[PDB]
Structures are given as structure tokens and as C-alpha cells.
Design a protein around this nucleic acid. Structure first.
Ligand SMILES: [Cl-]
Ligand SMILES: [Cl-]
Ligand SMILES: [Cl-]
Ligand SMILES: [K+]
Ligand SMILES: [Mg+2]
Ligand SMILES: [Mg+2]
Ligand SMILES: [Mg+2]
Ligand SMILES: [Mg+2]
Ligand SMILES: [Mg+2]
Ligand SMILES: [Mg+2]
Ligand SMILES: [Mg+2]
Ligand SMILES: [Mg+2]
Ligand SMILES: [Mg+2]
Ligand SMILES: [Mg+2]
Ligand SMILES: [Mg+2]
Ligand SMILES: [Mg+2]
Ligand SMILES: [Mg+2]
Ligand SMILES: [Mg+2]
Ligand SMILES: [Mg+2]
Ligand SMILES: [Mg+2]
Ligand SMILES: [Mg+2]
Ligand SMILES: [Mg+2]
Ligand SMILES: [Mg+2]
Ligand code: NA
Ligand code: NA
Ligand code: NA
Ligand code: NA
Ligand code: NA
Ligand code: NA
Ligand code: NA
Ligand code: NA
Ligand code: NA
Ligand code: NA
Ligand code: NA
Ligand SMILES: [Sr+2]
Ligand SMILES: [Sr+2]
Ligand SMILES: [Sr+2]
Ligand SMILES: [Sr+2]
Ligand SMILES: [Sr+2]
Ligand SMILES: [Sr+2]
Ligand SMILES: [Sr+2]
Ligand SMILES: [Sr+2]
Ligand SMILES: [Sr+2]
Ligand SMILES: [Sr+2]
Lengths: 119, 237, 194, 46
RNA sequence: GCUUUACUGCAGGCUGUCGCUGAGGACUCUCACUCCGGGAGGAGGACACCGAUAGCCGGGCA
RNA sequence: ACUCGUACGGUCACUGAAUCCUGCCCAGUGCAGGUAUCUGAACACCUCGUACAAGAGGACGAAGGACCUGUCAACGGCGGG
RNA sequence: CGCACGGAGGCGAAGAACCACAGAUUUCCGAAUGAGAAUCUCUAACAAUUGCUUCGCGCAAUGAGGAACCCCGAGAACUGAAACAUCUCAGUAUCGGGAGGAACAGAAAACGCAACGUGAUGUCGUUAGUAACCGCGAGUGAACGCGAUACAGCCCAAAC
């Protein structure tokens, strides 16, 4: 909420998570805030995911601005457990990143473009 | 020295407490959701041990039985009303806004919904003076002009039992019996009649206060006795 | 490159600036309505917790404790006292609020032992600290190479004896040289002059 | 006064403790109850 | 033990200042905070309370 | 605590039923109110000083005091010539 | 066949008594824990607070004691200063909390015989009534080092 500045529609989120699953089964993904943060810094992040139900918020606060001064696009997910399941984890995940997608390059690109229009 | 009587008071020991367990009811304005729709019948008139004045037992339409701070002229059988659209008759309770100016009121609220604070003793009453969209001015029994929220509820009429103060106690026994019903230590020994150790005015070979009686507001407890921050004293001038 | 943790750390270097400021103003409202000791699922400051020995593991607990701000709540003398000993107002306690916080927490969890604690801010009348506690009886910890040291009998009630880091710090044991003459090996052994 | 079952057991013990050192103990030990209590002269507990 | 314009201090009261504490020399506001209200909600409001310090009074007490 | 109390109350004091009455004094002391001007601490601010600091000075000035007024059914006073 | 030498009687070569180790039994109150109570009572009990958790008291923890010693907190006054306020008595007496068989401390953001030097920590001897404090009064009072004792050095957080 303090780091969230734009609302992502449920349908748009569905598109994003579906793309994440195929991204792990084809390309490559990073699970967990630490790994996600390094991707944004190293430049290998194509699309980063950030959960909105993170408590404490400190854990993710930095993403929305780190991704900006690195030109990396990000999208907000409503639930931490859905992001983790999409990434293929039994547990939840505060943040994940698509490091080089796979057969989702078109979808991801569009999703990234849709977010820009959504402010 | 030793702590003065005023200090023993604050400890709230048995001697200084009021016989609450003997008290009847915390006479507060009945709560109503809205719309005003609420009335009751006076079932009886009782003596209130805490105020030495009469109190009306009232049974409401919803079945609630509660003692009420009775104004003068209320009797068994009478129908009392409480709400925004209540009838402007003695015994009824409605916000100061709905109460026409120039009309005597009692048991006035200080903050809307508190249940009544001002003008509750025998015979007293507050005078509702000015209306407004923001404030209703009332003249309390002390003569002070009190600006209040027009939403503050109040009962119409003067409190019952007026004139109680007109008859003298005559003898100590009568005072004794009244005192026994209040949170007060009685009788009263004059400070000047005590030993120096017991009170600032104590000591001396003859009875007279040590220094002058008018004490500063800033005086600490144990010393604040006599004429507390008096703006003047005596009768002349 | 930088750890995600380093960002939580950097944010907390100035709890009155940026997002953290907004966050604190919001949380403190909820904290003021909470109890004295409140167990919490996750540390408010991950970097600090982990840095202090915390682990997302069974037997590791965290609790936020609030203690009143200010000097000693002292009762004035009721018998003869020389002017030096007649004070009340300016007297301060020798244990710091963080240490009081740690103890109040340890008492709430009789079976757990205090591992460490850290500050999470303060309003105008109280301070909050989050204490990391450990269950010395859970096998998850009895087998943890990094934490099983706290399972030793001599670590029982370590907070009440000042064995905590904040405890040792408050006992004036930081310096190994000059200034620590009356503090090491213990305040009591040095006649209580530390 | 009203005695409870326990008070009564103690009073009972106190009364039996008030017995004399049996005749045989004198012979066996080749020669005194230091706890000889009297209802009037002495005073029990409780 | 007691007294006081004895000496020296310590509580306590009053008062300024810092923190809590925010938006647009006097003022508006609401979001912290306080109170009223079962509640919805109302009043108050960056004051008050509380923490800290400074000046004044201070046989109430040592 | 007072208080299931709200000035026809309750707190703090003095005097001490009734009856006839209760003069004069506000300079000192107390209390309270006001106050142009004077005095009045700390923080912040300005000058000097110190590559910083200690420190010196300045500006502003709260309650309080000066000053003014009210008050004796306040403490008390009611003489010499 | 206790202290304890009596009377009656009994036990022991089926090896008793007696001693060592191990085990059985082990009423009621008691931290006292189902609830209450001056050691009893009433109708299934980890009461209370916690951790784990099959979220069920299922598996666990705490409580109280102990001669002093130990560690963390609160903290006098008589007294000395030929009075007394800072100072002193003294961080003493006493109080709150807590561990162990010992505690605490401990592998340098050290020392500073200033070095081309020492090398975790306690403790003992000394340094020394020295430096330092103090109505610079009365009084108060270290450390580095040195000689010894015993010696021991490691693990995380993060980077990846
Ligand atoms: Cl009366
Ligand atoms: Cl502990
Ligand atoms: Cl050396
Ligand atoms: K002394
Ligand atoms: Mg009432
Ligand atoms: Mg009268
Ligand atoms: Mg009474
Ligand atoms: Mg009298
Ligand atoms: Mg007398
Ligand atoms: Mg006498
Ligand atoms: Mg006195
Ligand atoms: Mg007289
Ligand atoms: Mg007199
Ligand atoms: Mg030792
Ligand atoms: Mg017999
Ligand atoms: Mg309230
Ligand atoms: Mg005295
Ligand atoms: Mg008389
Ligand atoms: Mg029981
Ligand atoms: Mg002396
Ligand atoms: Mg001398
Ligand atoms: Mg000393
Ligand atoms: Mg040294
Ligand atoms: Na504990
Ligand atoms: Na010291
Ligand atoms: Na007897
Ligand atoms: Na005496
Ligand atoms: Na005068
Ligand atoms: Na046994
Ligand atoms: Na148990
Ligand atoms: Na259970
Ligand atoms: Na002497
Ligand atoms: Na003397
Ligand atoms: Na001195
Ligand atoms: Sr989770
Ligand atoms: Sr009321
Ligand atoms: Sr009420
Ligand atoms: Sr007198
Ligand atoms: Sr007159
Ligand atoms: Sr324990
Ligand atoms: Sr007798
Ligand atoms: Sr008379
Ligand atoms: Sr005067
Ligand atoms: Sr060594």
C-alpha cells in the first residue's frame, strides 16, 4: 500500500501470473525478494512481480523505485501465496522476477506495455 | 507535621466515602436511537438517598423500568416522553434545540448523550435563553451563562423538592442523619482549634490563625487551607 | 551486489524520512492499542533480526514490547535523608528501556530465552523494541549448529543476569581497555562502581 | 467454639502425647516427660 | 517534636521551550492525539495529555 | 476518593442558639486583578571568538517582581503630641 | 529384635543382624497445578503463562528449595569530618529478580614501559597509597607494565 501507487485489475493479474508459470517451465525465474532485487540490479530482470499483502512492508518498499532507475517493468499481485504458487513454490513469495522468459515474450512485452498505460 | 484532614480525604477510606451500596439509581437520560418514538408511564415516586429529593419510577413502552430525576409536578399515571419530537410538557426530555426559549429546564447534558450533568439538585433549574444552528445558551443555577451544543438533551421543569434549604436543621442530630447519607466526614473541628502539628492554623496560646487566611492557588496540598485564592474577603467595599 | 536486506537497513537509518515515516505514523496507531508484549509472526526489521541471530525456523519467536519513556518513576523519601538523597525528579534508572523491554518479554515467555532485541521506534510517550526469543527445548534448535548454544543450562534466564548483548553493553563492558576498570569481569565484583 | 475434623485430630494427638513414660521404659533405661501439658496451666496452638 | 521573612534543599503549583507534531505576528484546517457517543457519529485538535528542560512561588516535606 | 453527587451542590476556612448589633483603617503582610514603561531563564536567532568547540555579547521576553487597583465576617491596627 | 540393660514373645544354618549398591512401597498439606479449605473437602483436571502442534494438554517448558559463594537491578542511616550541607560511613545494611557447581569474563574499533614493542579473560604477588579525586578539609584511590597461575580458540550477518 505505501509502495503501491496503481491498482492492477484482477484480469490483468491473471495474465501476468499465467505468463509466470510458463516462464518457469520454459525460460527462467527468480523467487524471493533477495534474488529479485539482485536481478533488477544486475539487469537480468525482464519483468518483476511484487505482492501487495507483505507485512512488514519494509521487505518490498524498495522495488518500485529500484526497478524505475533500472528501466525494469514491474506489476503488483494481490496475494503473496499466489505469486509463490505461480513461481512453483509450496510456500508464498513476496517477490519474483522473470529472468529471460520463454514462449511468453509476446505476453510479457504486452503486459509490460499495459502497465505503462495504467500509469 | 501530620497530613491534614483534607489529605486523609483523598485516600478514599471508609470514613470519607459515600454509602453507595445504599444508593438507588444513577439517574441518566434514557438512550434513544432516533426518531424520538419513546414514552413511559410514571409508576411510582420514591425518595432518593443520594440527593434528599424525590425521584420518579417510570416504566417504558419497550418494557424498561428505570428511576428518573423527577421535576416538580410529576405524579403516578402521568406519561413522560423522551426524544427529538417529544411534547413540550414538564417531565419530558428533548434536545435544547427543540426546547422553546424562555422555558425552565433541569438535568441538562454537558456533552450530548452524557445523561445529564447540570441543574440536578432540589428546586434548581437552568434557563434556556438563546437558540442557534451551532449553540444554545443556557443560564445555570449559579447565574453563569453557559454556551452549549443544541443537541444536548434536557428535561423540562424545575427539579422537585424545592425549598428544602428553607427549613433549618435546628439541632445536631438532624445534621448527623443527613451527613450519614453523604460522602463527608462530620462534625468539623476548626483548624485553629488544633495543634500546630495537625494543621497550618494550629498552635498558639489562644485560637487564631498563624498567617493570613488567603492562600495562593499554587500552594501545595497540606498547606492549601483557609481562603483558597480569594479575589476578596469580607462583606464591605 | 546489494542485498535486499540492505534496503531495510538503509530505510531504518532515518525512521523519520521517506516511506518509513508514513509507515511508522500508520503502524504506531495500531501499536498504541496493542498490549505490553505482542508476539508477531515476522520481524519489522528483517536485516536487523537476521543480523542478530534470527532465523525463519521453528523455536524462534519475536515479540514487540512497549515501555514508557522518561526517567525513574520514583517515590519521594518518607524518612530522614541528606539533601543529596532527597531527589526524585532527576533520578534515572541504571538499566536502559531496551533492557526493561527485554525482561518484560522474557517474563511473558517463561520457557523461552532472550536471544537479542532491537528498536522499532517511539512516539511522544513510549518506546517499542522487538525481542527475539528462542525455545531451548525444541529439537529444531537443539540441533541448530548456530543456535544450540542457548540450550545450555547456564543460559537459563540469561536476560535477568545481564548476559544479553544490550545487557553487556549497559553493564559498561564494550571497551576492553581504558574506562572498563570497574566494569569487567562484573559490576558486582568491582564493588558496584561501574 | 466449633472444631473442624483436622483441628479435632490435632487436639486428639495433643491429648495422647500427654500420656506418661511407660513403666517399662524406666526399667529398660535404668532411669521424665518434658511435654506434660495441662489444659489450664498450659496453652496449645491454633 | 514544633515554628519561622534561620541556612540548605526536596516535593508540589504556575510559566516558557523541545519532543509527540501534521496540511494551508495573526489565522485557517485535519490526519496524529484527547474527550463525548452503543453505534453511526459529535466536540476538541496540533493545543491538551505525556516525556524533557528552564524561571517563579514553595516549612507541604527533609 | 468526593461521586448512583452537579451550585437548594461540595469543597476550604472562620464565628458559634435566640435578641440588639457588628464603627474606622488597604500603609506593612496575604490573596486577587490590571499593567505604558522597567526587570525577568532556557531553547531558537544574530555578533565576536574557535578551520569546530568551550566562551563573551546582543536581540526577543513567559509566569513572577517593580508599579496601579480591589479586598479586613484576610493577618492585623485603632496612638504621642 | 534402634536410642533403651523391661516383661511376654519372636527371628536367624532356608545364613538373620549388620554394611554397600540397586529396586519396591512411599498417607495428607506443601511450587502445589480441577475447585475450594488453618494439613480437610467438593465434582475429571499440566491451575497459570508459554513453545511445538496431528490445533487434542497430543509433545514439551516454567514455578519452588539450597550454607554461603555468583550475576543483574533498588539503595539508607547512625558514624567520620571533633558542629555541618559536598565529602564520609558505602554502592555498605537492607530490599526486588535470577543461574551454576561454581558464577561472571573472554579472543582487541586492546595496550601506548611510543616501540624495530606487547598480544583473549579471570585470579594471585607487585606496580602503590603511586597517578587521579577532594569545604584541595577529613578523607578517597586506579591502570598500563612486570613476576606468577592456567592457557584456546572459534561461530554468525552479508557478498556469491
Ligand atoms: Cl448539609
Ligand atoms: Cl532469558
Ligand atoms: Cl607492552
Ligand atoms: K550523612
Ligand atoms: Mg444519575
Ligand atoms: Mg448553611
Ligand atoms: Mg459517613
Ligand atoms: Mg467546629
Ligand atoms: Mg489544644
Ligand atoms: Mg497543648
Ligand atoms: Mg505546620
Ligand atoms: Mg475564640
Ligand atoms: Mg479567633
Ligand atoms: Mg568474579
Ligand atoms: Mg485420658
Ligand atoms: Mg472515557
Ligand atoms: Mg523542619
Ligand atoms: Mg467555644
Ligand atoms: Mg487446591
Ligand atoms: Mg560529625
Ligand atoms: Mg573542618
Ligand atoms: Mg569511594
Ligand atoms: Mg591504562
Ligand atoms: Na523466559
Ligand atoms: Na562509574
Ligand atoms: Na489452656
Ligand atoms: Na520531642
Ligand atoms: Na493594608
Ligand atoms: Na522414601
Ligand atoms: Na507441567
Ligand atoms: Na494442547
Ligand atoms: Na565529632
Ligand atoms: Na550534631
Ligand atoms: Na568533597
Ligand atoms: Sr506464508
Ligand atoms: Sr453520570
Ligand atoms: Sr453514561
Ligand atoms: Sr495558631
Ligand atoms: Sr464594613
Ligand atoms: Sr527460572
Ligand atoms: Sr489462664
Ligand atoms: Sr449570636
Ligand atoms: Sr494590601
Ligand atoms: Sr594465551
Amino acid at each position: 500500500p505505501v509502495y503501491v501507487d496503481f491498482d492492477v485489475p484482477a484480469d490483468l493479474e491473471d495474465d501476468a501470473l499465467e505468463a509466470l508459470e510458463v516462464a518457469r517451465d520454459t525460460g527462467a525465474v527468480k523467487k524471493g525478494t533477495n534474488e529479485t532485487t539482485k536481478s533488477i540490479e544486475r539487469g537480468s530482470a525482464e519483468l518483476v512481480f511484487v505482492a501487495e499483502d507483505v507485512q512488514p512492508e519494509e521487505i518490498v518498499m524498495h522495488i518500485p523505485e529500484l526497478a524505475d532507475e533500472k528501466g525494469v517493468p514491474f506489476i503488483f499481485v494481490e496475494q503473496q501465496d499466489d505469486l509463490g504458487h505461480a513461481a512453483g513454490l509450496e510456500v508464498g513469495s513476496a517477490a519474483a522476477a522473470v529472468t529471460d522468459a520463454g514462449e511468453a515474450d509476446a505476453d510479457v512485452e504486452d503486459i509490460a506495455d499495459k502497465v505503462e498505460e495504467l500509469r | 507535621g501530620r497530613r491534614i484532614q483534607g489529605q486523609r480525604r483523598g485516600r478514599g477510606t471508609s470514613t470519607f466515602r459515600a454509602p453507595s451500596h445504599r444508593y438507588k439509581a444513577d439517574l441518566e437520560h434514557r438512550k434513544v436511537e432516533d426518531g424520538d418514538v419513546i414514552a413511559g408511564t410514571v409508576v411510582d415516586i420514591e425518595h432518593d438517598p443520594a440527593r434528599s429529593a424525590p425521584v420518579a419510577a417510570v416504566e417504558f413502552e419497550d418494557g424498561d423500568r428505570r428511576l428518573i430525576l423527577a421535576p416538580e409536578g410529576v405524579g403516578v399515571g402521568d406519561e413522560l416522553q423522551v426524544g427529538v419530537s417529544a411534547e413540550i410538557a414538564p417531565g419530558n426530555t428533548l434536545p435544547l434545540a427543540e426546547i422553546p426559549e424562555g422555558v425552565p429546564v433541569c438535568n441538562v447534558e454537558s456533552s450530548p448523550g452524557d445523561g445529564g450533568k447540570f441543574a440536578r439538585a432540589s428546586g434548581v433549574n437552568a434557563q434556556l435563553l438563546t437558540h442557534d444552528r451551532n449553540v444554545a445558551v443556557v443560564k445555570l443555577p449559579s447565574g453563569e451563562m453557559k454556551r452549549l451544543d443544541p443537541q444536548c438533551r434536557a428535561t423540562i421543569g424545575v427539579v422537585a423538592g424545592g425549598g428544602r434549604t428553607d427549613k433549618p436543621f435546628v439541632k445536631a442530630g438532624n445534621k448527623h442523619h443527613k451527613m450519614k447519607a453523604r460522602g463527608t466526614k462530620w462534625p468539623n473541628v476548626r483548624g485553629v482549634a488544633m495543634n500546630a502539628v495537625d494543621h497550618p492554623f494550629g498552635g498558639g496560646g489562644r485560637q487564631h490563625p498563624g498567617k493570613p487566611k488567603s492562600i495562593s492557588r499554587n500552594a501545595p496540598p497540606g498547606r492549601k487551607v483557609g481562603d483558597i485564592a480569594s479575589k476578596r474577603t469580607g462583606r464591605g467595599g | 551486489a546489494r542485498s535486499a536486506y540492505s534496503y531495510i537497513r538503509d530505510a531504518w537509518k532515518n525512521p523519520g524520512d521517506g516511506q518509513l515515516a508514513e509507515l511508522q505514523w500508520q503502524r504506531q496507531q495500531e501499536w498504541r492499542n496493542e498490549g505490553a508484549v505482542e508476539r508477531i509472526e515476522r520481524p519489522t526489521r528483517l536485516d536487523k533480526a537476521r543480523s542478530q541471530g534470527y532465523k525463519a525456523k521453528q523455536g524462534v519467536i519475536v515479540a514487540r514490547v512497549s515501555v514508557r519513556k522518561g526517567s525513574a518513576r520514583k517515590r519521594r523519601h518518607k524518612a530522614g535523608r541528606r539533601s543529596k538523597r532527597q531527589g526524585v525528579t532527576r533520578i534515572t534508572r541504571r538499566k536502559d528501556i531496551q533492557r526493561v523491554a527485554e525482561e518484560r518479554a522474557s517474563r511473558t515467555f517463561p520457557n523461552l530465552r532472550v536471544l537479542n532485541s532491537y528498536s522499532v521506534g517511539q512516539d511522544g510517550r513510549q518506546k517499542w523494541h522487538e525481542v527475539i526469543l528462542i525455545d531451548p527445548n525444541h529439537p529444531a534448535i537443539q540441533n541448530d549448529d548456530d543456535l544450540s548454544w542457548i540450550c545450555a543450562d547456564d543460559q537459563a534466564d540469561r536476560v535477568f543476569r545481564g548476559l544479553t548483548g544490550a545487557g553487556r553493553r549497559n553493564r559498561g563492558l564494550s571497551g576492553k581497555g581504558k574506562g572498563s576498570e570497574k566494569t569487567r569481569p562484573s559490576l558486582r565484583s568491582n564493588g558496584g562502581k561501574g | 467454639g466449633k472444631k473442624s475434623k483436622a483441628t479435632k485430630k490435632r487436639l486428639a494427638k495433643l491429648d495422647n502425647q500427654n500420656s506418661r513414660v511407660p513403666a517399662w521404659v524406666m526399667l529398660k533405661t535404668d532411669r521424665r516427660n518434658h511435654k506434660r501439658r495441662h489444659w489450664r496451666r498450659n496453652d496449645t496452638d491454633e
